[PDB]
Amino acid sequence: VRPKITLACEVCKHRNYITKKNRRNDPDRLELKKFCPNCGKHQAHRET
Amino acid sequence: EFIYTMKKVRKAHGDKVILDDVTLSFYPGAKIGVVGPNGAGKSSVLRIMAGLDKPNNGDAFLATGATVGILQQEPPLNEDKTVRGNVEEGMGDIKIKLDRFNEVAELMATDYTDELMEEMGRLQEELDHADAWDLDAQLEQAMDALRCPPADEPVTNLSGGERRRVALCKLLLSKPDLLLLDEPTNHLDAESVQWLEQHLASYPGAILAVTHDRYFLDNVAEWILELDRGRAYPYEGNYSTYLEKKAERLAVQGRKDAKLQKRLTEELAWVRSGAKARQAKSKARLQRYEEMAAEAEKTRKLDFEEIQIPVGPRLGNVVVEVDHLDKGYDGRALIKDLSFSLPRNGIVGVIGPNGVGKTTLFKTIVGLETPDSGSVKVGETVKLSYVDQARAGIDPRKTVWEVVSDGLDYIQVGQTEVPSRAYVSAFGFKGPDQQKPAGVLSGGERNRLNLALTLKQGGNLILLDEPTNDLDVETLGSLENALLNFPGCAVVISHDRWFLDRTCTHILAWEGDDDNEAKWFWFEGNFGAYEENKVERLGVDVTHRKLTRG
RNA sequence: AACAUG
RNA sequence: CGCGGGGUGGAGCAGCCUGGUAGCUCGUCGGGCUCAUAACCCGAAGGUCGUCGGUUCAAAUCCGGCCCCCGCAAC
RNA sequence: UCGGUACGGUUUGUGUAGGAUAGGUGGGAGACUGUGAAACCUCGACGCCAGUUGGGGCGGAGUCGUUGUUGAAAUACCACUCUGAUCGUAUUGGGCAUCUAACCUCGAACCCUGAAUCGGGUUUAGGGACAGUGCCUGGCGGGUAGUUUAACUGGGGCGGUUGCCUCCUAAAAUGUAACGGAGGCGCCCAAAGGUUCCCUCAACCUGGACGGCAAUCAGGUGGCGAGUGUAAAUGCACAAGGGAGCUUGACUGCGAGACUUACAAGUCAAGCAGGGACGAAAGUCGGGAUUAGUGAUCCGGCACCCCCGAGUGGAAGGGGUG
RNA sequence: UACUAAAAACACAGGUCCGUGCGAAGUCGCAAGACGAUGUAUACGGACUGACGCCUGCCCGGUGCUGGAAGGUUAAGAGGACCCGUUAACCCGCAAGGGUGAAGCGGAGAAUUUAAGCCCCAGUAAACGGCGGUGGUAACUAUAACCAUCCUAAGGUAGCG
RNA sequence: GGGAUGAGCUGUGGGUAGGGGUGAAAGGCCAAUCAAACUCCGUGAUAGCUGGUUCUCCCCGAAAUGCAUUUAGGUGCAGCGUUGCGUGGUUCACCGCGGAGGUAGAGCUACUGGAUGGCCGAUGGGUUACUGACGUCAGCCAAACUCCGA
RNA sequence: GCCGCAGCGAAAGCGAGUCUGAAUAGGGCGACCCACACGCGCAUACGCGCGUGUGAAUAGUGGCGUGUUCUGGACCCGAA
RNA sequence: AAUAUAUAGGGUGCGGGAGGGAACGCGGGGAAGUGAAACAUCUCAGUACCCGUAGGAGGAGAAAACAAUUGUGAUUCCGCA
Numbered sequence A: 001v002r003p004k005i006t007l008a009c010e011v012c013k014h015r016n017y018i019t020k021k022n023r024r025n026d027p028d029r030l031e032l033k034k035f036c037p038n039c040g041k042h043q044a045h046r047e048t
Numbered sequence B: 001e002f003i004y005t006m007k008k009v010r011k012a013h014g015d016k017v018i019l020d021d022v023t024l025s026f027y028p029g030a031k032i033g034v035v036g037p038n039g040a041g042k043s044s045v046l047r048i049m050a051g052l053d054k055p056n057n058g059d060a061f062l063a064t065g066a067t068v069g070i071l072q073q074e075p076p077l078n079e080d081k082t083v084r085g086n087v088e089e090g091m092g093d094i095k096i097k098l099d100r101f102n103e104v105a106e107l108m109a110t111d112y113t114d115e116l117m118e119e120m121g122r123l124q125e126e127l128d129h130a131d132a133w134d135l136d137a138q139l140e141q142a143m144d145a146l147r148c149p150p151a152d153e154p155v156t157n158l159s160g161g162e163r164r165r166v167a168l169c170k171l172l173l174s175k176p177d178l179l180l181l182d183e184p185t186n187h188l189d190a191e192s193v194q195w196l197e198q199h200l201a202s203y204p205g206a207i208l209a210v211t212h213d214r215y216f217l218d219n220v221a222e223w224i225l226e227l228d229r230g231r232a233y234p235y236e237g238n239y240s241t242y243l244e245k246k247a248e249r250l251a252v253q254g255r256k257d258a259k260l261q262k263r264l265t266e267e268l269a270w271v272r273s274g275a276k277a278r279q280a281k282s283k284a285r286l287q288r289y290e291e292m293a294a295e296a297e298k299t300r301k302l303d304f305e306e307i308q309i310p311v312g313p314r315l316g317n318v319v320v321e322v323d324h325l326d327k328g329y330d331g332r333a334l335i336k337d338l339s340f341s342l343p344r345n346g347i348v349g350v351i352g353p354n355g356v357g358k359t360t361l362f363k364t365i366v367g368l369e370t371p372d373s374g375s376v377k378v379g380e381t382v383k384l385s386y387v388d389q390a391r392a393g394i395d396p397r398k399t400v401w402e403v404v405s406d407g408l409d410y411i412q413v414g415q416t417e418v419p420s421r422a423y424v425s426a427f428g429f430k431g432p433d434q435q436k437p438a439g440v441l442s443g444g445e446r447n448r449l450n451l452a453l454t455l456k457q458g459g460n461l462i463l464l465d466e467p468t469n470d471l472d473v474e475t476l477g478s479l480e481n482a483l484l485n486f487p488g489c490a491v492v493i494s495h496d497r498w499f500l501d502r503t504c505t506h507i508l509a510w511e512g513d514d515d516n517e518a519k520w521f522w523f524e525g526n527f528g529a530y531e532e533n534k535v536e537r538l539g540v541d542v543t544h545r546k547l548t549r550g
Numbered sequence C: 001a002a003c004a005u006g
Numbered sequence D: 001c002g003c004g005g006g007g008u009g010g011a012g013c014a015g016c017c018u019g020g021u022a023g024c025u026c027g028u029c030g031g032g033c034u035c036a037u038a039a040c041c042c043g044a045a046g047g048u049c050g051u052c053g054g055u056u057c058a059a060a061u062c063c064g065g066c067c068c069c070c071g072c073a074a075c
Numbered sequence E: 001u002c003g004g005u006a007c008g009g010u011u012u013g014u015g016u017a018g019g020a021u022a023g024g025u026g027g028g029a030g031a032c033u034g035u036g037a038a039a040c041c042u043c044g045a046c047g048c049c050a051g052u053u054g055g056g057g058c059g060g061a062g063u064c065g066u067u068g069u070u071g072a073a074a075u076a077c078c079a080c081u082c083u084g085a086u087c088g089u090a091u092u093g094g095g096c097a098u099c100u101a102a103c104c105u106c107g108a109a110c111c112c113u114g115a116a117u118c119g120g121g122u123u124u125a126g127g128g129a130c131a132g133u134g135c136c137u138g139g140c141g142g143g144u145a146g147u148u149u150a151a152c153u154g155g156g157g158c159g160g161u162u163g164c165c166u167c168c169u170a171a172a173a174u175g176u177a178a179c180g181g182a183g184g185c186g187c188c189c190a191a192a193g194g195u196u197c198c199c200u201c202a203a204c205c206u207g208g209a210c211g212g213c214a215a216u217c218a219g220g221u222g223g224c225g226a227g228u229g230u231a232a233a234u235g236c237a238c239a240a241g242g243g244a245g246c247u248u249g250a251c252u253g254c255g256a257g258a259c260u261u262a263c264a265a266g267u268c269a270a271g272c273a274g275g276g277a278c279g280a281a282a283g284u285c286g287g288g289a290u291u292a293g294u295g296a297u298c299c300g301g302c303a304c305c306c307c308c309g310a311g312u313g314g315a316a317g318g319g320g321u322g
Numbered sequence F: 001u002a003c004u005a006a007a008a009a010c011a012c013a014g015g016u017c018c019g020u021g022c023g024a025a026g027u028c029g030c031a032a033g034a035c036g037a038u039g040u041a042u043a044c045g046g047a048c049u050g051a052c053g054c055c056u057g058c059c060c061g062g063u064g065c066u067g068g069a070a071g072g073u074u075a076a077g078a079g080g081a082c083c084c085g086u087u088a089a090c091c092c093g094c095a096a097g098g099g100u101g102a103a104g105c106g107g108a109g110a111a112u113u114u115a116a117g118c119c120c121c122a123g124u125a126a127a128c129g130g131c132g133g134u135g136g137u138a139a140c141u142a143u144a145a146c147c148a149u150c151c152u153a154a155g156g157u158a159g160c161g
Numbered sequence G: 001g002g003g004a005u006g007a008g009c010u011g012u013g014g015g016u017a018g019g020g021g022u023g024a025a026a027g028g029c030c031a032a033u034c035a036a037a038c039u040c041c042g043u044g045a046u047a048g049c050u051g052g053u054u055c056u057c058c059c060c061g062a063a064a065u066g067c068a069u070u071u072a073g074g075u076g077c078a079g080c081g082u083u084g085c086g087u088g089g090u091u092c093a094c095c096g097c098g099g100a101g102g103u104a105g106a107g108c109u110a111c112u113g114g115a116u117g118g119c120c121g122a123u124g125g126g127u128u129a130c131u132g133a134c135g136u137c138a139g140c141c142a143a144a145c146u147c148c149g150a
Numbered sequence H: 001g002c003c004g005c006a007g008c009g010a011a012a013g014c015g016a017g018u019c020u021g022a023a024u025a026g027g028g029c030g031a032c033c034c035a036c037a038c039g040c041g042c043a044u045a046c047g048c049g050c051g052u053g054u055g056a057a058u059a060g061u062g063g064c065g066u067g068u069u070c071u072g073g074a075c076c077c078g079a080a
Numbered sequence I: 001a002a003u004a005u006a007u008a009g010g011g012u013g014c015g016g017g018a019g020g021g022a023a024c025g026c027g028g029g030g031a032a033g034u035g036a037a038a039c040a041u042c043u044c045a046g047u048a049c050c051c052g053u054a055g056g057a058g059g060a061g062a063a064a065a066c067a068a069u070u071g072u073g074a075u076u077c078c079g080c081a
């Protein structure tokens, strides 16, 4: 009920972060501003 | 070679799967019929094939240059016009590039003269791709076959259930090579389906229908695709061949699982009581109980709660008095010179084709209209309950519980204080399935939701308007054996001719011809009498239109 | 065609 | 000593695991039929779901710990 | 006899308006007397407008035709072919049947054979492309074969326990055993995380409609007796506890010095920079008041970095980071 | 049981069941062969029982054996959509490069077709096996011939103790 | 003591060979050896087990604990012995000085649990024989109680 | 031919340096001599930067001995 | 010969084979104890034992070979790698 999701950037689509969410609380894919190292600045990140 | 194909496709939430291991493939010209219960995934397979969603595993691969159409279970439109409803899709790669050919030829001379050779002739190239580009004389060809509304009026509340006749003309003009028509025969007539019968027969291209009618499934379809709840199984033959081999399959499956359930109980006590029996082997025999008990719970599905219509006040002796009513619009002549009482404790049926005015007649009774020259007496003991044809009380963003309860805790239904969450699961939403949005609900659970916010008053005068749509035979029988046990005045508009033969006591019906198009005949008795009274009083007791050049 | 006993 | 079932109306018992509603067979109280009792037919009454409370909008049910009832237990 | 492929002739299609677009595309004055008025008629196709000149058994004369012009097009006529139907040759595959010639015979007869119930050979009687055997392939298989079946235990067996977190035993640093005494864990939280700004609780006395020993109100005394997402211990009123606004540091690149420690692991960390959030700033943030919520190596899977590429170019595979 | 056990152990006569239509079945053999047998269902091998007299009750759920038109699941063989490596040519630009790619040859191959078995449906217990509880009731008590009920594939009959 | 004209006893020649024979069946018998014979060979099998290991002196000198173990009678690493090269009083004791504690003790109108006699008095019992709290003045107890404290 | 003669890196490689990194930030491993005088933008003083020698001390490889060890029966005897 | 072409078979004449040997060779079959601190893949080992069969030696051998933009030019055997 707590699966491990990975978070991919919007522009370069690299996979930089893995984390846990609750699936009966949040059905849709998360969005966070995290730090993409290949871009050098904070970008948006959905799930896969 | 294959129009459409699937790998190990599994569209699902990880808590609740809706497709699982769907491996099959289709040919060109594959007329398919899809059958199954509600809650299987019949519309979440036709949604992958038109690219409107993506699976969570497995590749869904259309062919190279074959385009696909779709008609969803609710048809969207645009709010512009009616002849706009034949240019958006369908003729959309010709019409948008039709005025531009008339725009590039406005005879500019200072701008460009010899650049009319690589763009105006290129637009001349694409008109030959369609083999016809006048587009006008062959567009009344597409609306004098569906019997469309007059093309110069917007699709506001002006359109009733012939909204579907327009959406069966955006789709059947594109002529896709894979045609995903999901329940086309909602809200249609005794002849609007009869047109669609002969049109889907001689149709070059594949066809997937999720229909329930019998002329398509017995004569047009060649493959039948059963959808079990997550599974998918193809079969070959028409629907008469399907149900015979389905019957002998569920025969030997009915005692496949009897001796399975007998086995689990015979070695239930072997693993629970008396664990003294064997040492250091017991962790190898205990797992064979769990490996058959975890597959005994993947077909344990028999939990189907009944549709129940609550009872409120005592209904008196007068319910609906219609005092020589006329109703119509500017130039239009619907209901004219009609007078009828409404029988206490009796199911009332309404008969008429699309465009006679059946659902406006209930809007008079609740109060959403006003009669032109007439009056309707309500009677101070009745209580209305109006479920609409267009299902307009569904707000497709907020969740299921918030549509029917308005965020409250107790709602007022049967002169009691019912806890409003318990009133939700009474129509089939167990627990954590309140929390999912109503715009994505199934065709059963959008018809098991419109009965929730409209039977919320316990009224002894309920006005059912298209109740027999998108629900299977387990609920359709559980409806008709639940509005017989209701103490008064259920009034039903329907088109399922094998529904009014079950549950009817009175019939209001249209009988108009070329003297006046707004007659309404009243009858005392069931549908198995009106079909015999009609042939002995009137004389009215084909020639198919092509929709294209050929 | 049902009908047992004080 | 310890292990593992079970408690649902006077008696025997379903309902659970896959939460919203308490039900069936005998019996008990009243009517009917008969000359009268059995049989049969119609209507009722009767339960804080063993108890002390944890989550939940909501627990007979999901959840443990205590109290009786039963089964099985030593070379 | 039933189906696939390949080729070939025939046949098939009806919105409305016109003598039912004879279906699409490309051409084109042609058909020659075949009247249609025999028949499975009306080409026997559809039998929906009830009719589309060809198995034509009065004929050799007259032929829907060119002319007529309603409609994107009516117009004869063959040729190329679309979704169907229907017959014909060729090829191949599946089923049953029949035949003899490969194989089968411990049916008989006659030879080598003088002595032969072996063997082989000849003729005959039957079985027959089955059987049997070979290569591959599933099923069955204690009929045989090699082996495993943990430890602790006041002697073994039956019960029970095995890792992680807190307390007591533990003798005022740390550590410390037993089948010693009490309890928890295999999560949960997208805010219950970060920040910035505010607030003081439980119980009680007096009084107050419903209102009760205790629901909310108002005033007094109240220094922590409540509360803490979870078990206990140490903390916490300065708040780490109650409430609100904006947000993602539940970060990428590193880390001097340490605690613990057989080793493998486990734990803390000022500070430096990239880039952010909060805040007027000072600064704070590398998840949760802290200590449980997990698992070494090998073999694999996925996304990226394009590092090596078995002569060379690539590729297969291997490699690095997650 | 030569060398601590001579019996209640084995055998036997008779009984029943299942196998076997004849170089049979079974057995020794990798095979040819041989025994069965110079026999042919009144014969021959396997199993339990054990003269003789009276008898041999109920259960086909479990697991074996026998017979089943189907239906579900299932190996190789057949089948080879789609995808991938390569490059004759064709693109754009810095001709240290990036994009599309017919044919031939390769790797990986999904749909579809296909047998016994297993599942399943029936018969068999002289096949391996199994053959129960609680509560109330009769002129003192005691006890229940009768009734209610649950569970079972069916609840221990004759005879004995 | 039992059979002693039978399923008897016996002589001579022959047959069946080791996961095989034969067995009126006991795991009995197959050259005094049988729950798988004997001989030779792989072979100097293997054994966390047992027994043995031979001349001398001089210096120094242990451990029976920790952690991990298909491990508890075994072993790896550390602890503790010896020795070579480096380091040089860093070790150890006593004195003075700077520090953390919650054991023995004791205390409880400082808390969480208990707990005994009076005054006091709600709920239960028979309109009040009994239940006597929360509180309140004195005396008590505590490994999982501590305002304290060697 | 082996071992020494230069190391870092997964490797292309670069080299008294190299890998990680966006970094002449920090680390990881590896190289790098004083007791002087003179010399020294000379500094209160104290040697850092750099010098000819005043000639700081590095050092490996191959034989034969000894202790332990690896593979072989491996200190010797012993099964069913 | 059956049975005709004829073979099977039979008479006569010349040659040749068989068995033995201590190790070495070539082709073929092929264990287990043991090591893995148990054990099955694995090892032990293509060893022990067996089978065909040589010769004074045998087998191998005159590129359908190797190498990498240079090049060595049949095989066996010992050293390095």
Ligand SMILES: Nc1ncnc2c1ncn2[C@@H]1O[C@H](COP(=O)(O)OP(=O)(O)NP(=O)(O)O)[C@@H](O)[C@H]1O
Residues within 6 Å of the ligand: B156, B157, B158, B159, B160, B161, B162, B187, B329, B332, B334, B352, B353, B354, B355, B356, B357, B358, B359, B360, B389
């Ligand atoms: N909002 C409107 N204003 C005016 N005329 C209307 C409107 N809606 C419908 N109409 C006309 O009324 C006719 C039928 O009305 P409608 O509301 O569709 O009832 P209905 O016949 O029951 N539809 P249906 O259930 O499909 O048969 C249509 O064909 C229109 O001509």
Ligand SMILES: Nc1ncnc2c1ncn2[C@@H]1O[C@H](COP(=O)(O)OP(=O)(O)NP(=O)(O)O)[C@@H](O)[C@H]1O
Residues within 6 Å of the ligand: B013, B018, B037, B038, B039, B040, B041, B042, B043, B044, B045, B073, B436, B440, B441, B442, B443, B444, B445, B470
């Ligand atoms: N996005 C979704 N998320 C979760 N459940 C969904 C979603 N979409 C559909 N479902 C459910 O999954 C099942 C799929 O059914 P769906 O294909 O939506 O229509 P259907 O019921 O299968 N056919 P019909 O009954 O005619 O509507 C139904 O039970 C739906 O309620």
Ligand SMILES: [Mg+2]
Residues within 6 Å of the ligand: none
């Ligand atoms: Mg939320």
Ligand SMILES: [Mg+2]
Residues within 6 Å of the ligand: B042, B043, B073, B182, B183, B210, B442, B443, B470
């Ligand atoms: Mg649907």
Ligand SMILES: [Mg+2]
Residues within 6 Å of the ligand: B160, B161, B357, B358, B359, B360, B389
């Ligand atoms: Mg309507």
Ligand SMILES: [Mg+2]
Residues within 6 Å of the ligand: C005
């Ligand atoms: Mg009588």
Ligand SMILES: [Mg+2]
Residues within 6 Å of the ligand: none
């Ligand atoms: Mg009565």
Ligand SMILES: [Mg+2]
Residues within 6 Å of the ligand: none
């Ligand atoms: Mg075969």
Ligand SMILES: [Mg+2]
Residues within 6 Å of the ligand: none
């Ligand atoms: Mg065995």
Ligand SMILES: [Mg+2]
Residues within 6 Å of the ligand: none
């Ligand atoms: Mg068996």
Ligand SMILES: [Mg+2]
Residues within 6 Å of the ligand: none
């Ligand atoms: Mg032990």
Ligand SMILES: [Mg+2]
Residues within 6 Å of the ligand: E153
């Ligand atoms: Mg013991």
Ligand SMILES: [Mg+2]
Residues within 6 Å of the ligand: none
């Ligand atoms: Mg201590």
Ligand SMILES: [Mg+2]
Residues within 6 Å of the ligand: none
């Ligand atoms: Mg101490």
Ligand SMILES: [Mg+2]
Residues within 6 Å of the ligand: E191
């Ligand atoms: Mg917050």
Ligand SMILES: [Mg+2]
Residues within 6 Å of the ligand: none
């Ligand atoms: Mg706070």
